[PDB]
Symmetry: D4
Subunit: 126 residues, 8 copies
């Protein structure tokens, strides 16, 4: 939960440097497309984006290439991307596809709370 | 509830001058984009729009800049915008981001019924 | 139910001449926009379209002008449009807005089954 | 279930050659449009796509022509398309519309598990 | 229920008549619900002439659900309640036949669709 | 419940006062829920002065639900609890009148909308 | 349940055979449901040869759920019912082992996935 | 529950330890659920050392829910179970104080958020 981790860091709201986005379900294409557009369209971008993968039951090559394109459009704007919540099958697929390599193994988290904690800590050390 | 407040004002339907829109969830981007397009596209615009924020659990800088852009496109068409239902965290974020300043502190309401009552009253005083 | 009325007419499937579309919820804008595009884009169009309004809790001037535009794009392709399921408040708004006049009072039905029955009968008398 | 069939084939994840897409509900137009765009936009395409029709209660001529266009855009990229889960009414409509002819009668499956099994087997025989 | 709304209007009504009751089994594990409704039907002073049992939300039935349903219908029959069944899916439809449920209520009282059952019930009540 | 939130604030409160309780019948087969709440109301040491029964989620009522509701309200009245009804749809509203439920609670205690009932309850409690 | 549909067809059936029953624990607080099903199984005249307990919707288990589940399975075993378990998540799977539930039903009767359990049950019933 | 997953891992566990149980009141009309869980807790041979009652899904409480909750906690205390409360919303939080529930469980045992309660419970169990 966002509430608990924010409070452990003396916060009530998400800091400006941090954004969170959840992949809709297995067919996150429409929603991913729009968010990519928003990210490329807004004046100011966050330092860190957490992509929540909890609601993704599986991924085929269409999801993989979509997510790959999505992360690259974030990186090119200086956004560090963290991944959280992939089930055990999607976790395997992300390694297999080179997505873990793409974000960095140290940026993939089994659970959202781990990613949020690490994001808040990185932001504070600054 | 819309029914109760309409009836307190001797009404069964929303008056032509009043529109209501609810932000989808935390990722209201797609839906906000379409409504912005509709608002800019229709011949006649309402005098007052109430944006319901009840279903928004948090907002990052991407939501903030989206909502900011959205409200500005409404203002430029002469639409007065009211905000309702922000939870206690989103309420803080809206102040922090300058969105409360943008709509006017007197146009932000803890609960939908307060905003609807005040909208119906403003419309009637005319 | 579609099953019961189809069977009363000796049918198992919707006849080619008949289409059915349901307005998403109060903010049917995105979905209405896409269906308008589909209707204008496909080679063959149905003779009769039933628009189901059951899931529409209220309508403001933005919904009204959207729905108005939508119905006009259908009429210009020779599509007869029926409306069904409007609650008692939306029913009033549709009269008020001139939408009942636009489709014809005889084409508005309190309940989906009435509209479907009348559509199947009109199609058969041919 | 995907888990059981994958395991019967000695697998934990969907093979790269196989994609799965589910038609949203009766008004799958928006989502079908986006996926068509994705399929035509990505560098690498799967060998086999399974379209799940379980959540489609009925289809009119608008859905039919949409789905027809969708499948043709897949075929032109060398994608073999399987259909699964059509209820007994939609099953009839698909024959009636020439969609079963279009994908091949041997590529239509009453239930998702049948389609997935047959897809995994075809992929392995290679 | 708009299906109910339409059939009522066809028969000149806006409300369910006193003689008719409608009950839905929800999900395959309707046991707790069946039990309470059986209790109410035995407990209330005034019983309906016809009960419609909607089975649309029952995806399968094993022997436990079958005996539960049998017992439930038996309780209604002993109070003089005529029971109609509607909306069994294709496989539950076959189970109902094989297990003697259709026999118990009568072939003429089993309806593929709720609206057929409600239409037939409203017609029977008017003729009485 | 933001409807509750707004009415409480109008009356200077943030919480429901001790004298007021709210209960919702959920779905047309509220029997099991009715039964347990009847039990609690008989079992607890301290009863509220006013109970609001929200009927918004009740799409129709047959004779079984009516007698269930009658019995439930009778149990509350014998403990001195004043019962308000709110949110009956258009057809349930007519049933309530025809079956003697409105008679049982009083015409002045039936409210088309929850917020009217809650407003009236908060006002009555303040005057006491 | 299409998973059920597919396995039935593989075995030449369209309906669940009389010898097989399926029950799902829904959510971590399955106690009230467990209780009623235990009651039905003790109450019905004819019991199935095999029961599958689906645990897919059970996200965690504490000692209260464990003893509830133990007791439930014990009631089924005394009526001669062979119990299969399917779909425990990764952590509930470890709990089941640690608490003696797997011991109670047998290792060979615990299935990662419902379809494996149903396949195995249909095969065992055919061999009998 | 990923919140549970994360806290367990922080403490080196994958499963809830035997000493800890978690129960959630779902919706404002938790009476039937409260009743059954009270029954189970009295019925099982082995009780947990700590129970967390999650109140996140409870939007308001009237006097009936309060006395129901009081009674429930009293039953747990007499079996030696330490009770923690978590997730009361802002108004339920004030009700709990005003009605003597916080007094009943102890101020130090009431947690704004489930994760704080679970962290504190896992720490207390380790120290024992």
């Amino acid at each position: 939960e966002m509430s608990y981790e924010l409070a452990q860091h003396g916060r009530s709201t998400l800091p400006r440097e941090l954004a969170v986005y959840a992949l809709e379900g297995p067919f996150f294409f429409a929603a991913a497309e729009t968010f990519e557009r928003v990210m490329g369209s807004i004046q100011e971008t966050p330092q860190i984006l957490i992509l929540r993968l909890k609601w993704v039951p599986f991924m085929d090559i269409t999801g993989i290439q979509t997510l790959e394109e999505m992360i690259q459009s974030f990186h090119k704007r200086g956004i560090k991307v963290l991944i959280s919540g992939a089930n055990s099958r999607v976790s395997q697929k992300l390694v297999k596809a080179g997505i873990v390599k793409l974000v960095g193994e140290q940026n993939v988290y089994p659970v959202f709370e781990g990613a949020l904690s690490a994001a808040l800590t990185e932001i504070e050390a600054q």
